[PDB]
């Protein structure tokens, strides 16, 4: 039932389903009380298209809750290829650029900071780019200037929860997944009492940020490689965070901007207080 092979038999579109079952579907044949196996708390099964409506109806009745439906063939092509991003190409900005040096930087900051969503030409931050070109500001400010912009506020903040925002923030600004439940919490409390702007500053003035990017380096991916004071399970979070080269942050998804890192998963790396 778990992770599948193959698709169809006569022909179908296999969908794999996931639920949470009562002892009504599955119980042991024991002398007392009806219980399902504790590890099949959420169970998944792959069903071809016709049997599918009948299965969902049954599951819902006898008590289960469907958690997901997704085609099997989507889910057979693995996990993302990460070769482009295991070790990236660094893009920095020199004192006295040749101009198109500066052209390189802007295109990359865009891609990285905005998480590969398209920024259309009406959309670009032109006055701010003027500033970088004249020196005036360094490659750090545009990383900070873009983040406080409406375009950044609008595709990533306004329409999703704070859990999601912060998780995106780590990916964009720091290039790495969020290590602890404390990190999520520490941030949510800051936004709540100092506002959005103070909270944005907190990733860009951090010691972690400063070491790796310094001030003239565009933030680049770095979570597919071992880092310091990183729990070990933050390397699996990175797969959940980045979905491949053609994937992007996208707020235009049918289901909306949502999570990607399970809250249960974060707790595995440690729980304390505050």
């Amino acid at each position: 039932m778990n992770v599948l092979t193959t698709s169809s038999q006569r022909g179908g579109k296999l969908f794999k389903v996931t639920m949470t079952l009562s002892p009504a579907l599955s119980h042991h044949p024991w002398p007392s009380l009806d219980t399902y196996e504790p590890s099949q708390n959420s169970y998944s099964v792959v069903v071809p298209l016709d049997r599918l409506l009948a299965e969902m109806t049954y599951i819902k009745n006898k008590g289960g809750r469907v958690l997901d439906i997704s085609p099997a063939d989507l889910e057979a092509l693995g996990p993302p290829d990460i070769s482009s991003v295991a070790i990236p190409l660094k893009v920095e900005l020199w004192a006295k650029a040749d101009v198109s040096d500066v052209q390189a930087a802007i295109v990359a900051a865009y891609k990285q900071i905005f998480g590969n969503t398209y920024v259309l030409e009406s959309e670009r931050l032109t006055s701010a780019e003027s500033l970088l070109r004249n020196g005036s500001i360094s490659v750090r400010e545009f990383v900070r200037l873009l983040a406080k912009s409406e375009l950044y506020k609008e595709r990533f903040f306004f329409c999703t929860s704070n859990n999601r925002f912060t998780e995106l923030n780590f990916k964009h600004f720091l290039g790495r997944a969020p290590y602890n439940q404390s990190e999520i919490a520490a941030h949510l409390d800051r936004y709540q009492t100092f506002g959005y702007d103070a909270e944005i500053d907190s990733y860009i003035d951090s010691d972690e940020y400063i070491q790796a990017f310094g001030e003239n380096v565009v933030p680049y991916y770095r979570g597919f490689k071992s880092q310091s004071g990183q729990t070990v399970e933050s390397f699996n979070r990175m797969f959940k965070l980045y979905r491949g080269d053609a994937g992007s942050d996208t707020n235009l998804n049918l289901q909306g901007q949502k999570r990607r890192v399970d809250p249960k998963n974060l707790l595995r790396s440690g729980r304390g207080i505050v």
């Binding site: 490689k225 071992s226 880092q227 310091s228 004071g229 070990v232 399970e233 699996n236 440690g270």
Partner: protein, 172 residues
């Protein structure tokens, strides 16, 4: 994040109580052995590079498949990632050792690896072997250092080992 005191405090609070005279003296003893603890953490910090290097040389001595094409420590990019992970784990083990709590180790970091590396297809037993190699050498250093006062560090050497063993178990 927890340390050994913070852990005591959380358990006391869950009773609604001031710390037990039991717990108080357990913590008085941790303060008693704290100079030794500082030397033990210092032993690791002061030889971090060699601990990783020596573990590494030996890992690939044993498992010459990792450095062939097709192998998970080939080409340079992957070897650098593997060397980096060795450092990351040695780092959090040293943090746990300063703290007296695997709350920055077992708690603050040993979970997804098993499934993730099994998914990445990375042989967990070999990864556990790398941690064992670091462990051997790290403890070597904890036990035989530069002009530290002579005494018994076996309690601390054990505790360091359990942090190395947590990591190994969690990953394999």
């Amino acid at each position: 994040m927890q340390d050994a005191f913070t852990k005591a405090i959380v358990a006391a609070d869950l009773r609604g109580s001031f710390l037990s005279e039991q717990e108080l003296n357990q913590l008085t003893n941790l303060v008693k052995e704290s100079n030794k603890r500082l030397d033990a953490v210092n032993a690791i910090t002061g030889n971090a590079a060699e601990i990783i290097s020596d573990a590494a040389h030996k890992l690939f001595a044993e498992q010459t498949d990792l450095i062939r094409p097709g192998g998970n420590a080939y080409p340079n990019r992957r070897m650098a990632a593997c060397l980096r992970d060795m450092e990351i784990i040695l780092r959090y083990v040293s943090y746990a050792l300063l703290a007296g709590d695997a709350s920055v180790l077992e708690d603050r970091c040993l979970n997804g690896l098993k499934e993730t590396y099994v998914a990445l297809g990375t042989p967990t037993r070999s990864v556990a072997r790398a941690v064992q190699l670091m462990k051997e050498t790290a403890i070597g250093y904890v036990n035989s250092p530069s002009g530290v006062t002579r005494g018994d560090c076996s309690a601390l050497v054990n505790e360091a080992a359990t942090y190395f063993d947590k990591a190994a178990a969690s990953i394999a």
